[PDB]
Amino acid sequence: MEKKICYFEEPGKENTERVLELVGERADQLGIRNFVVASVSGETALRLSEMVEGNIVSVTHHAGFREKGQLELEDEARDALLERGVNVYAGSHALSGVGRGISNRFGGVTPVEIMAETLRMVSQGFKVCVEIAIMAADAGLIPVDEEVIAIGGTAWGADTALVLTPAHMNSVFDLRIHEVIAMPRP
Amino acid sequence: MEKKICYFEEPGKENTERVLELVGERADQLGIRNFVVASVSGETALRLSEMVEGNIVSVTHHAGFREKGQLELEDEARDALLERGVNVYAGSHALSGVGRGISNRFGGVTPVEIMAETLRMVSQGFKVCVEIAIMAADAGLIPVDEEVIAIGGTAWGADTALVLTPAHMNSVFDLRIHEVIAMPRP
Amino acid sequence: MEKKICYFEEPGKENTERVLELVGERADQLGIRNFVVASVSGETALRLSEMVEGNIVSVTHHAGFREKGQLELEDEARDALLERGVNVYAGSHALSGVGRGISNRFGGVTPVEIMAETLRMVSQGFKVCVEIAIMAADAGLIPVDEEVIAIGGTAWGADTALVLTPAHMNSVFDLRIHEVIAMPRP
Amino acid sequence: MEKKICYFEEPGKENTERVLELVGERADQLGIRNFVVASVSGETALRLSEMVEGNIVSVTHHAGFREKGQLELEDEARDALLERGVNVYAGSHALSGVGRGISNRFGGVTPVEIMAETLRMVSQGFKVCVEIAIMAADAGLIPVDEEVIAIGGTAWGADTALVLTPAHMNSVFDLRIHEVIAMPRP
Amino acid sequence: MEKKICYFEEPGKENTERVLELVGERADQLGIRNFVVASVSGETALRLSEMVEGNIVSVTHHAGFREKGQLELEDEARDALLERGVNVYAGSHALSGVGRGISNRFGGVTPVEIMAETLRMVSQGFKVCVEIAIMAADAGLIPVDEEVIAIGGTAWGADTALVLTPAHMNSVFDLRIHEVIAMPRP
Amino acid sequence: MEKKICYFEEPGKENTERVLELVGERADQLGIRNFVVASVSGETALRLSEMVEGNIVSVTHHAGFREKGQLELEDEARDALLERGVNVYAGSHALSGVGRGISNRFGGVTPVEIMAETLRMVSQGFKVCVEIAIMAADAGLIPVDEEVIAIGGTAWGADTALVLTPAHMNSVFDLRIHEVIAMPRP
Ligand SMILES: Cc1cc2nc3c(=O)[nH]c(=O)nc-3n(C[C@H](O)[C@H](O)[C@H](O)COP(=O)(O)O)c2cc1C
Ligand SMILES: Cc1cc2nc3c(=O)[nH]c(=O)nc-3n(C[C@H](O)[C@H](O)[C@H](O)COP(=O)(O)O)c2cc1C
Ligand SMILES: Cc1cc2nc3c(=O)[nH]c(=O)nc-3n(C[C@H](O)[C@H](O)[C@H](O)COP(=O)(O)O)c2cc1C
Ligand SMILES: Cc1cc2nc3c(=O)[nH]c(=O)nc-3n(C[C@H](O)[C@H](O)[C@H](O)COP(=O)(O)O)c2cc1C
Ligand SMILES: Cc1cc2nc3c(=O)[nH]c(=O)nc-3n(C[C@H](O)[C@H](O)[C@H](O)COP(=O)(O)O)c2cc1C
Ligand SMILES: Cc1cc2nc3c(=O)[nH]c(=O)nc-3n(C[C@H](O)[C@H](O)[C@H](O)COP(=O)(O)O)c2cc1C
Ligand SMILES: [Mg+2]
Ligand SMILES: [Mg+2]
Ligand SMILES: [Mg+2]
Ligand SMILES: [Mg+2]
Ligand SMILES: [Mg+2]
Ligand SMILES: [Mg+2]
Ligand SMILES: [Mg+2]
C-alpha cells in the first residue's frame, strides 16, 4: 500500500503540530489505540491527549538529567495529565542505560549507545521513538503484540512518529518498525 | 568505628523474616527517611510496608521477564501496595538492560552485565540491591544526595540488603555503598 | 513536504518491480543521478539500469560469503553489466567486516554488527541500504557529498530503497537518511 | 547467623593499625591457614607478618607501575619480607592487565577494568582485596578450595579486608566472597 | 628450512628496492604468482610489476582517508597500472573499518582495531600485509586457497613483505603467516 | 642486515633442539643476556640453562590450568632450576587474563584474547613469546629497555623464538618485536 509521509524541511519544535496531526489520521486509518510520547516538560503528551483517546504514555527524562537529583517534570503536570487518563513515566533511557555512566567516566561507548547513534542516522526523533517504545514495554505501560505509535522529536517538541511493535529489553531485537508517519529530512 | 551484621548458611526464601526483622531493626536503628526493595510479587514488600516510616518503594520484574507483556505485580497486589501508602515501580533492570537483549540475541555479554556478575560473587541478592537501587533513583523517587537503605534477596525471598548513597545512570559510578546489614555467606 | 511511500505487505523478490519504478520517479523528482544497488547475481542491477540513467554502482557479495575463495557474481553477469556502464564492485561487507570473522570464532558480537541488527528493526534492505552506501563511498564509487538513492532487499531482488547521503567508514555517523521511497512493513 | 565489622570515617594511612589489629583479631578469631595482602613497599605486610600463623603473602605493584622496569618492593625489604618467613609476589594486577594497556593507548575501558570500578563503589581498598586476592591464587600459592583472608587498603595503608574463597582467572566468577571485616564507610 | 630474512635498521621508503628484489627471489624459489601490494599513489605497485610476473593486485587507500569524498589514487596512475595488467582496488580498510568511524566519534577501540595495533608490534607494514591480504580476498582479487606474497611499508613505499595464505573476513583467524621475507627491526 | 631464519616444516616438540640451538648463536651474535622461556614441566628452561648463562626466567602455566587447585610444576624442578640460577615464575597469562574467565561463563571474547588470536596468525609460539615477555616484565624478572629472547612453542617443547623488547602491561603496545629466530611455517 501507498501512503503519505511528511518530511520536515528542518528538525525541531516548529514541526510539533503537523506530527500530532498525522498521528491522528494514521492512528484512525489503522485503529491504533496505543500512544507513546517523549515529553519532558509535558507540553506534548498534553497537546496529544486532547486530539486522541486510548492509552497515552508520557515518558519524561530520567531523574536528574540536567541537574542530578531533580527531574524536569513537576507533579504539577504529572497531574494535569494523570487527570486526562494519560500514564506518566520517568525511568532510565533504554538506549543509553548505565553504559552511559561508564562512558562518562572512561569515555568509550557501550553496545546500546551504538544502537542509539545508528538510529540517529535517520533523525533524533527516530531514535527516541524506539527508546520510549522499549521503556514502556518493560514498564508494562504498553503491548508487545500490537502495533503502536511512538512520538518523538529533536530536543523539544516533535518531528518524528512511528508505527511500530514494541519489544522488551531482553528481546529488544524483536522490535519491528512498520511505518514512518513523519520525520525530519536532514 | 563500628556496627553489626549477619550471615545466612544457605540461600533463599526462609530468610526474609530474619532478614526483614533484622533489616528493619538495623534500618530503624540507623534512622533514615528513604527506602527501596525487590519483590517480584509484592509479599516481601508487604511484610516490609508496616515496619518503616517515610518512603518505601517496591520495584518488580520488568514486564515480559517471563512472557511478553506480563508484569507480575498482580494488580490485586499493585492496588494493595500503592494503597498501603507506598510507591510502586516497574522498569528495565538497570544492570542488564537492552544489553541482555543483545546477549540473548548474540551470545556473550556487555559492560553493564559485567557488573551484575561481579556483584553476584558475594550474593545474587547482593547485586539486585544495586540494580533496583539504581532504577529507583532514576525514577525520580529516592535520593542520590542522602542515604537510602537497599534491600533485596535471592530466588524467592529477601536475604541481602545494604546502605548506600545510590546514584543515576549518567553518573553511575558515583554510587557509594556505606554499610552491610545481612547477606548469604556463600 | 508530503510525498508517497510504499509499504510492502511482505518482504521479498516480488516487490522488486515496484521499487525499481518508485526509484525512477523519485529520482526525476529530486534530480538524483547516483544509485548504489545490492545485486549478488546482478539481475536486480540489470533491471535498474534500464529505467534509470547516471552513475549506477552494483555491489555483490564478498568472495567467501558462501564458499571459501568463491565469488557469487558470475563473470558473465559482471561482463554484461560493465558492458552497460554499471560500475561493479565487491569487497568485505561494511556492517559486519572482520568483526564477523571474530564472532564466527568466539560467539558474541562486535560493535559494528550491532549497528546492523539495529538497522534491521526496519527491514533487511534498510540495513543493506546504508551498508552498501558506506562500501561504495569508501571504494570511491559514489560521493559522500550529495544525495544518492540506495536499493536493497531481502535475500533476493529488492524491497527497500532509501534517499540518503553516504559517508565514509571513518565518519560513518555522518551518514544521513533522508527519504524512504519504499520498505517492507513487517 | 551473625558476626562483627567496622567503619572508617575518612580513607587512608591512619587505619592500617586499627585495620591490622582488628583484621588480625577477627582473622585470628575466625581461624584459617592461608592469607594475602597489598603493600607496595612492604611495611603494612611487615606489621602483619608477626601476628598470624601459616601462609601470609605480600603482592606488590607490578614493575613499571611508576617507571619502566622498577618494582617497588625494595630488595632491602624483599629480603626482609621473604626472610620474615613469608612469600612475596609481583605480577600484573588481575583487574586491569593488558586491558589497562589498551585503555592507556586508546581511551576507554575493557571488561576486566569494568569490574575493578564496580568493586570500587564501596571502597578503593575493596577492589584490590579481590585483585591481589586473585593473583595470589593464580601463582599457585593460596587456595581456591578453602577460605582465605583478603586484606588491602586505600592510597597508602590497609583499610579494607574480607573473607572469600578466591578463584582463578579461567574460572574467575566462581569466586565467593564470605565475610566483611572492616572498610572505609564512604 | 633455513633461509634468509632481511632486518632493516630503520623503517621507510628507502628500503623499497631491497624488498622488491627480495620478493622476486623468494617468489621464484617458492613458485608464487600472486602478489598483493599496498600502494596509495601506485608508485610501489609500478616498480613491483617490472620484477615479478603473475597476478598483481595493488590496493590503495579508501576514499575519504584524507579528505571527504576524495580518492588519493590519481586517475592517471590507476590507468598506468591497469595498462600493465595490475588489478587495482580500493575499499574500506580491513583492520579498522567502520569500527574506526565509531572510535572517531566515541574514543575507545573496537575489537578489529586491536588486531591491528597487535600486528604493529612487529612493524607497520606487517599490519598492512595481513590487512591488504584480507581485503584482496574479499574482493575476490586473490585466493585464500594458496600462498601469496604480501607487501607493505611505513607510510611511503615498502619495508615489509610476508609469505602467507589469505583468508576472508568471515574466517579471518584462518589467515596463516608463513615466512617473513623482510621487516624493519625497530 | 641479512640473517638466517629457520621455518619448521611442522610445529611442535620435534623442533625443540634446533630452536634452542639458534637461540645460542643469535644471543651471542647479539650479546643478549636475557632469556624468557615458556616451560610448563620445566623440560625446556632446563635444556636451555645448560647451553647459555645470564638471566633465564622460566614461566609455567597459572595455578590450576589443567585441574583447578594444583599447578603443573613441582617444586621438585622449581629447585632443579632454582639451583641453576634460573628464575621461576607462575602467574596469570597476560594475553588471556580474567577476560578469559568471563568468556568462559558468557562465551564471548575480551580485547586481550583477541590480541592472542591475532598473534596466533603466525604461530602459537609466536603468541606465547609475547605473552611471557609481558608477564616477566611486570614481574620485574626482565628489562623493558633492553632486547631479550623469548622462547615458546606449540603445546610442549619449543618451535618459536623471538628477539624482542618487553613492555609492561600498562604500556603493552610499546612491546617491539625485532627478529624472528625460528618459527613453524604453517
Ligand atoms: C527518554 C527521553 C529520551 C530522549 N532523548 C532524546 C534524544 O536522544 N535526542 C533528542 O534530540 N531529544 C530527546 N528527547 C526529546 C524528545 O524527543 C522530545 O523533544 C521531548 O521530550 C518533548 O518534551 P516537551 O513536550 O517538553 O518539549 C528525549 C526525551 C525523553 C523523554
Ligand atoms: C528488578 C529485580 C531484579 C532481580 N534480580 C535478581 C537476580 O539477578 N538474582 C536473583 O537471584 N534474584 C533476583 N530478584 C529476586 C528478588 O530480589 C527476590 O527473589 C524476591 O524474593 C521476589 O519477591 P517475592 O518473594 O515477594 O515474590 C530480582 C527481582 C527484582 C524485582
Ligand atoms: C554486501 C551486501 C550485503 C547484503 N546483505 C543482506 C542482508 O543483510 N540481508 C538480506 O536479506 N540481503 C542482503 N543482501 C542481498 C540484497 O539485499 C538483495 O536481496 C539483492 O537483490 C541480491 O541480488 P540478486 O536479486 O541479483 O540476486 C546483501 C547484498 C550484498 C551485496
Ligand atoms: C596489586 C596492588 C593493587 C592496588 N590497587 C589499588 C587501587 O586500585 N586503589 C588504591 O587506592 N590502592 C591500591 N593499592 C594500594 C595498597 O593496597 C595500599 O595503599 C598499601 O597501603 C600500600 O602499601 P604500603 O602502605 O605498605 O606502602 C594497590 C596495591 C597493590 C599491591
Ligand atoms: C589499505 C592500506 C592501509 C595502509 N595502512 C598503513 C598503516 O597502517 N601504516 C603505514 O605505515 N602505512 C600504511 N599504508 C601505506 C603502505 O604501507 C605503503 O607505505 C605504501 O607504500 C604507500 O604507497 P606509495 O609509495 O605508492 O605511496 C597502507 C596502505 C593502504 C592501501
Ligand atoms: C604462560 C604460558 C602460556 C602458554 N600458552 C600457550 C598457548 O597459547 N598455546 C600453545 O600452543 N602453547 C602454550 N604454552 C606452551 C609453551 O609454548 C611451551 O610449549 C611449554 O610451556 C614448554 O613446557 P615443557 O618444557 O614442559 O614442554 C604456554 C605455556 C606457558 C608457560
Ligand atoms: Mg516543547
Ligand atoms: Mg533525516
Ligand atoms: Mg556473602
Ligand atoms: Mg518493517
Ligand atoms: Mg564502604
Ligand atoms: Mg620491528
Ligand atoms: Mg616437553
Ligand SMILES: [Mg+2]
Ligand atoms: Mg606459521
